[PDB]
Amino acid sequence: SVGLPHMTQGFWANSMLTEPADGRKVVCHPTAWDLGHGDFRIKMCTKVTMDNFLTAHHEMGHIQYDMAYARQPFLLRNGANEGFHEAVGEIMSLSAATPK
Amino acid sequence: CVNLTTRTQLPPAYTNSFTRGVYYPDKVFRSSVLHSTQDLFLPFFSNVTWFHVIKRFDNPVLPFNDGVYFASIEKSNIIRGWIFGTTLDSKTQSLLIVNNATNVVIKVCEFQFCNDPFLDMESEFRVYSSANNCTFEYVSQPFLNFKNLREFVFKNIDGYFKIYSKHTPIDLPQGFSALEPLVDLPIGINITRFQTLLALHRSGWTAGAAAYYVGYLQPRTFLLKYNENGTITDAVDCALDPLS
Amino acid sequence: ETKCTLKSFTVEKGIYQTSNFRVQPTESIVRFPNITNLCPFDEVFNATRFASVYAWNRKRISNCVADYSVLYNLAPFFTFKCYGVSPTKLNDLCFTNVYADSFVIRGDEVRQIAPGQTGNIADYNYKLPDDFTGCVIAWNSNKLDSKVSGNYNYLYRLFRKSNLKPFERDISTEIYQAGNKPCNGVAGFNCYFPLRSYSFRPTYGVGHQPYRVVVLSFELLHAPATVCGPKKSTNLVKNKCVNFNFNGLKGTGVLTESNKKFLPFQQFGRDIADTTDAVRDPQTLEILDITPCSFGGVSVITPGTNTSNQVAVLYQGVNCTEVPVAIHADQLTPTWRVYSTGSNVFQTRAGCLIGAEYVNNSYECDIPIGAGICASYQTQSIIAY
Amino acid sequence: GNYNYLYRLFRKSNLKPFERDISTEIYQAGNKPCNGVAGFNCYFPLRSYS
Ligand SMILES: *[C@@H]1O[C@H](CO)[C@@H](O[C@@H]2O[C@H](CO)[C@@H](O)[C@H](O)[C@H]2NC(C)=O)[C@H](O)[C@H]1NC(C)=O
Ligand SMILES: *[C@@H]1O[C@H](CO)[C@@H](O)[C@H](O)[C@H]1NC(C)=O
Ligand SMILES: *[C@@H]1O[C@H](CO)[C@@H](O)[C@H](O)[C@H]1NC(C)=O
Ligand SMILES: *[C@@H]1O[C@H](CO)[C@@H](O)[C@H](O)[C@H]1NC(C)=O
Ligand SMILES: *[C@@H]1O[C@H](CO)[C@@H](O)[C@H](O)[C@H]1NC(C)=O
Ligand SMILES: *[C@@H]1O[C@H](CO)[C@@H](O)[C@H](O)[C@H]1NC(C)=O
Ligand SMILES: *[C@@H]1O[C@H](CO)[C@@H](O)[C@H](O)[C@H]1NC(C)=O
Ligand SMILES: *[C@@H]1O[C@H](CO)[C@@H](O)[C@H](O)[C@H]1NC(C)=O
Ligand SMILES: *[C@@H]1O[C@H](CO)[C@@H](O)[C@H](O)[C@H]1NC(C)=O
Ligand SMILES: [Zn+2]
Structure with a gap:
């Protein structure tokens, strides 16, 4: 709704959004993996709480940031400084948390 | 390819074509009418070159012209096919018509023709070493005490190669007969010379008697007669004598 | 009509040819x-x-019939990019031959197959001319040409000394030297192989999924063209005056069953005046006779306009059963249909006479109709005798 | 590159002399209606010189 591209179809297929039932174990840590070759995934357990809502938005900011530099020769696909990565997800979380 | 130096050469003979070589100019039906046409015909009472093979052996590279009338009195099909082209080698593009045991095959390519191409039931051929680059191929039903008279007319105009044909159970006989159209090919190539193809049988070799005749077409005016069933039954050559 | 033909507002007794x-x-x-x-x-x-x-x-494609109407059953592909002609029902052209090239590329290099384009495929793999006539069709093959471990079969060129000429293909496996020293045939420093692999995997995005690309190029040479396209046909109607097209023979008239026996190779037929009067249907091999639709001349029999305004009409050389009936417009006479059933239709060897009563008496001729038949204004009405 | 110039490519019939058509409707290529959206068998009639 702000002017960002829509997510890929495979993003919703390769991403874990709910805790597995049985047979698999997850380290229980929210991560946003950039697998490579245009592959992006979110690994986290999502619960019914605004804490999980804020964490999901924070990881979604990282997801938007990571795909935003997919057009670089594998050496510029980072940030200019180490602070840009965690700054992107903070503003989105703050804006969505406003009472309006 | 193989070379057999056993030829018995004698000069080609000359004989008379009386009224042979009339074909249907087009595909229009006309009934009980007299129609005047101007086209490439073999003039009446003309000189035609005569070759015979029995050991008689001769396969000259005769020159092509506005068109060719080909005749063969034969039995058991010693003569099989033809080659058309300009240089008869791999430098230029040549057309080849072969009469298989069961199908006629037409191919235009850059063949490498030997000095003596011929066939030798026998299923061996000595014509070309390889086909370089082919742009047309066609296959269909075969074209073919002396008993068999085969008459052919070959024309090459506006990129189309036309073959008219007639077969008769029988030098050249008296009478009239019109050659119905047989084949039209959009080859779109240039032809300047041609050379016949015989099939030998090794038993050295023994070959049966056969004769073939070559004549050349020229532009002329004819008056043709169509009977009730659209058949050409008679013709008049307007430039032969005062009476015509 | 008689008044306009005579360029006058008055007409004298007689018979006049009008239309x-x-x-x-x-x-x-x-x-x-x-x-x-x-x-x-x-x-x-x-x-x-x-x-x-x-x-x-x-x-190489030649001596066939192009069928550009089955591609709509193909994949949901969005790449049908055609240059030189328009793909909107414009496949009726005839070409001497068609060259079809096929390969597989990555999803992001589909735009590189176009004239005036630079890149890796366009400069080292496949070059297209500026005057390229034809078009490119690319469809996704993610479910068939991808491997979980990696489809390392497909390869491509990465390093070349120069660009590729249009319609050129090289399969040389020589080592590309980037430095200033001989390679000696070994892959050491400043020397790498020019061929690399794609390693297709199904988990990749749309930009890395394999895509199959086919390029059609049409040639128009001086040789006769033999690749044309589907020739559609209607059904034929007989005993009705219609327009017709038979293998390029155009005309108008009535088609009927014919007793003529054509020779097997003959297509048309002509009469003694050299006009087409028979035809052969290309699909079903029988003979149809062709007849022109009815036509003739019209003559108006009138007494003087000083006497009356009644007229009679003669249709010349026409049987009275083929007299005009009309619906709205099937007759070049400017729609002045004269009554037929109740207006004393009479048949003469000169034609069909309408508007006159035939009597059994005999008089001296007044207005000559023909073949011993005359007309007069007597009693008051117009009579023929 | 100037894209301000457009011209028509797809039309049902040839145009009569001295007629002006400014129809922006999506040309019906396929039998199924385009419903006002371009795509497969649905192309924008006007394209640019560029
Ligand atoms: C053109 O195709 C039609 C296809 O129907 C052919 O018509 C059929 O011909 C067969 C003979 O093989 C008959 O048994 C059918 O009854 C025919 N059906 C119809 C509807 O006509 C027709 O013969 C073909 N023409 C040529 C020249 O091949
Ligand atoms: C054999 O070769 C000679 C010359 O090498 C040539 O003149 C001749 O035509 C060839 N063929 C036969 C059958 O002699
Ligand atoms: C045919 O050729 C012969 C030579 O054998 C010649 O004498 C004659 O004049 C030519 N023409 C005719 C009509 O015989
Ligand atoms: C037709 O020609 C081929 C070679 O082109 C040959 O193998 C085949 O035997 C021939 N057909 C017959 C019936 O002999
Ligand atoms: C094969 O011959 C045709 C006709 O001459 C020609 O157009 C074509 O370019 C030739 N093929 C090659 C590879 O040169
Ligand atoms: C055949 O005719 C064509 C058309 O003029 C010409 O280009 C070609 O050179 C001719 N063939 C030869 C062998 O010269
Ligand atoms: C022509 O056709 C008729 C059929 O009407 C047939 O009787 C006759 O034999 C055919 N040939 C000739 C020469 O009349
Ligand atoms: C490929 O197969 C499909 C199967 O339905 C068919 O519809 C399609 O026409 C085929 N492709 C071609 C070029 O014939
Ligand atoms: C006119 O048509 C009728 C109806 O078929 C026919 O009986 C008659 O012979 C034809 N000719 C004349 C002169 O009446
Ligand atoms: Zn974060």
């Missing part, structure tokens, strides 16, 4: 022979093993 009569056909027949010469398609499209982009597969 003509026609039939004005309806509907069209477009019969063409059976469409039985299958294009070599379904083998370069529905194939099972394509080739590399640097070794793209080439096929």
Whole structure:
């Protein structure tokens, strides 16, 4: 709704959004993996709480940031400084948390 | 390819074509009418070159012209096919018509023709070493005490190669007969010379008697007669004598 | 009409030739022979093993009938980019031959197959001319040409000394030297192989999924063209004055069963005046006779306009059963249909006479109709005798 | 590149002399209606010189 591209179809297929039932174990840590070759995934357990809502938005900011530099020769696909990565997800979380 | 130096050469003979070589100019039906046409015909009472093979052996590279009338009195099909082209080698593009045991095959390519191409039931051929680059191929039903008279007319105009044909159970006989159209090919190539193809049988070799005749077409005016069933039954050559 | 023909407001006693009569056909027949010469398609499209982009597969297509109407049953592909002609029902052209090239590329290099484009494929693998006529069709093959461990079969060129000429293909495996020292045939420093792999995996995005690309190029040479396209046909109607087209023979008239026995190779037929009067249907091999639709002349029999305004009409050389009946417009007479059933239709060897009563008496001739028949104004009415 | 110039490519019939058509409707290529959205068998009639 702000002017960002829509997510890929495979993003919703390769991403874990709910805790597995049985047979698999997850380290229980929210991560946003950039697998490579245009592959992006979110690994986290999502619960019914605004804490999980804020964490999901924070990881979604990282997801938007990571795909935003997919057009670089594998050496510029980072940030200019180490602070840009965690700054992107903070503003989105703050804006969505406003009472309006 | 193989070379057999056993030829018995004698000069080609000359004989008379009386009224042979009339074909249907087009595909229009006309009934009980007299129609005047101007086209490439073999003039009446003309000189035609005569070759015979029995050991008689001769396969000259005769020159092509506005068109060719080909005749063969034969039995058991010693003569099989033809080659058309300009240089008869791999430098230029040549057309080849072969009469298989069961199908006629037409191919235009850059063949490498030997000095003596011929066939030798026998299923061996000595014509070309390889086909370089082919742009047309066609296959269909075969074209073919002396008993068999085969008459052919070959024309090459506006990129189309036309073959008219007639077969008769029988030098050249008296009478009239019109050659119905047989084949039209959009080859779109240039032809300047041609050379016949015989099939030998090794038993050295023994070959049966056969004769073939070559004549050349020229532009002329004819008056043709169509009977009730659209058949050409008679013709008049307007430039032969005062009476015509 | 008589007044306009005579350029006067008064007419004297007599018979005058005014205009003509026609039939004005309806509907069209477009019969063409059976469409039985299958294009070599379904083998370069529905194939099972394509080739590399640097070794793209080439096929030559000739002496067939193009069938550009089955591609709508193909994948949901969005790439049908056509240059030189428009793809909107414009496949009726005839070409001497068609060259079809096929290869497989990545999802992001589909735009590189176009004239005036630079990149890796366009400069080292596949170069297209500026005057390229034809078009490119690319469809996704994610579910068939991808491997979980990686499809390392397809390859491409990465390093070349110079660009590629249009319609050029090189399969040399020479080592590309970037430095200033001889390679000696070993891959050491400043020397790398020019060929690399794609390693397709199904988990990749749309930009890395394999895409199968086929390029059609049309040639128009001085040799006769033999690749044309589907020739459609209507159904034929007989005993009705219609327009018709038979293998390019155009005309108008009535088609009927014919007793003529054509020779097997003959297509048309002509009469002694050299006009087409018979035809052969290309699909079903029988003979149809052709007859022109009815036509003739019209003469107006009138007494003086000083006497009356009644007239009679003679249709010349016309049987009275083919007299105009009309619906709205099938007759070149300017729609002055005269009553037929109740207006004393009479038949003479000169034609059909309408508007006059035939009597059994005999008088001296007043207005000559012909063949011993005259007309007069007596009693008051117009009579023929 | 100037894209301000457009011209028509797809039309049902040839145009009569001295007629001006400014119809922006999506040309019906396929039998199924385009419903006012371009795509497969649905192309914008006007394209640019560029
Ligand atoms: C053109 O195709 C039609 C297809 O129907 C052919 O018509 C059929 O011909 C067969 C003979 O093989 C008959 O048994 C059928 O009854 C015919 N059906 C119809 C509807 O006509 C027709 O013969 C073909 N023409 C040519 C020249 O091949
Ligand atoms: C054999 O070769 C000679 C010359 O090498 C040539 O004149 C001749 O035509 C060839 N063929 C036969 C059958 O002699
Ligand atoms: C045919 O050729 C012969 C030579 O054998 C010649 O004498 C004659 O004049 C030519 N023409 C005719 C009509 O015989
Ligand atoms: C037709 O020609 C081929 C070679 O082109 C040959 O193998 C085949 O035997 C021939 N057909 C017959 C019936 O002999
Ligand atoms: C094969 O011959 C045709 C006709 O001459 C020609 O157009 C074509 O370019 C030739 N093929 C090659 C590869 O040169
Ligand atoms: C055949 O005719 C064409 C057309 O003029 C010409 O280009 C070609 O050179 C001719 N063939 C030869 C062998 O010269
Ligand atoms: C012509 O056709 C008729 C059939 O009407 C047939 O009787 C006759 O034999 C055919 N040939 C000739 C020469 O009349
Ligand atoms: C490929 O197969 C499909 C299967 O339905 C068919 O519809 C399509 O026409 C085929 N492709 C070609 C080029 O014939
Ligand atoms: C006119 O048509 C009728 C009806 O078929 C027919 O009986 C008659 O012979 C034809 N000719 C004349 C002069 O009446
Ligand atoms: Zn974060």
